Amino acid sequence: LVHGGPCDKTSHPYQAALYTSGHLLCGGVLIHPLWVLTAAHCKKPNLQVFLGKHNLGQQESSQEQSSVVRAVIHPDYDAASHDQDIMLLRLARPAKLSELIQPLPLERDCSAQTTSCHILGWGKTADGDFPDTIQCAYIHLVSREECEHAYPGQITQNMLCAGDEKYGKDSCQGDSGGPLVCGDHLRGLVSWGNIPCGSKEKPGVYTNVCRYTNWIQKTIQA
């Protein structure tokens, strides 16, 4: 993510790192000891999940690694439009919760009043490189009508937009599937956005997690 800075060590216990072939692919969000939520476009064979991470290159006492035994892509995911960009990853064993590994509760209210949010991830930073330390930035939700104005014909009710008019703080490549946290609830998942990354003019676009309460509950409880 661009124009942010390193997160506080204790402030992101729900952040997941998704790896393939030993390298970062995407972010994700622990929402249940057995399940990580992420973007459908992060689907690849052989996903590996790391919980409790802060610095990717360090072997950290708090980290847990888990293979993914099932990846449930939303049935209505449309890769071409990025609509319904959400997927559930079943962990091979329940995460062992701690101060540094905790689920994040979902925002169930699509009309929730908190409009200032945090985004987090190990995606590309403003220098064009990938960071070792997880990055954080504070941004603000943008109305449907304003975001539709930025991306005509491309925004659905399953998307939520957020950005920063002053510095352009924004998610970027490698942040997909990571969390947009508003009022200490999961409000969105990093999905897509402008090229170059940077939200001064066009906001970042996030999967609208409040729309997926029923499917998530059904999938976890099966």
Author numbering: 16 to 36, 38 to 67, 69 to 125, 127 to 130, 132 to 147, 150 to 205, 210 to 247
The authors write:
Kallikrein-related peptidases (KLKs) compose a family of 15 secreted serine proteases which orchestrate a protease cross-activation network known as the KLK activome, with a variety of roles in homeostasis and disease. However, a current lack of approaches to specifically detect active KLKs has limited previous studies to measuring total mRNA or protein levels rather than functional KLK activity. KLKs are secreted from the cell as inactive pro-KLKs and must be subsequently cleaved to generate the active form, while endogenous protease inhibitors can further modulate KLK activity. We next investigated the binding mode of KLK6 ABPs by X-ray crystallography, to illuminate the unnatural amino acid interactions underpinning biochemical potency and specificity.
An optimal balance of potency and selectivity was found for DPhe–Ser(Z)–Dht–ArgPP (P4 to P1), with potency driven primarily by P2 l-Dht and P3 l-Ser(Z), and P4 d-Phe providing selectivity, as the only d-amino acid tolerated by KLK6 but not by KLK8. Biotinylated (bABP 17), alkyne-tagged (YnABP 19), and Cy5-tagged (fABP 21) ABPs were synthesized and validated in biochemical assays. bABP 17 is highly potent for KLK6 (kobs/I = 11,000 M–1 s–1), selective over KLK7 (>30-fold) and KLK8 (>70-fold), and >600-fold selective over two serine proteases particularly highly expressed in PDAC: urokinase plasminogen activator (uPA) and tissue plasminogen activator (tPA)33. The absolute stereochemistry of the active ABP was posited to mimic a natural P1 l-amino acid, and this was later confirmed for 16 and 17 by X-ray crystallography (see below). The P2 L-Dht side chain is well-poised in the S2 pocket, with the indoline nitrogen facing a water molecule buried in this pocket that mediates a network of H-bonds to His99 and to Tyr94/Ala96, providing an explanation for the increase in potency imparted by this amino acid. The P3 l-Ser(Z) side chain contacts an extended hydrophobic patch extending out of the S3 pocket (Ile220), offering an explanation for the increase in potency observed on switching from P3 l-Cha to P3 l-Ser(Z), since bABP 16 shows a less optimal fit in this area of the protein with a less defined binding mode for P3 that varies between the two KLK6 chains in the crystal structure.
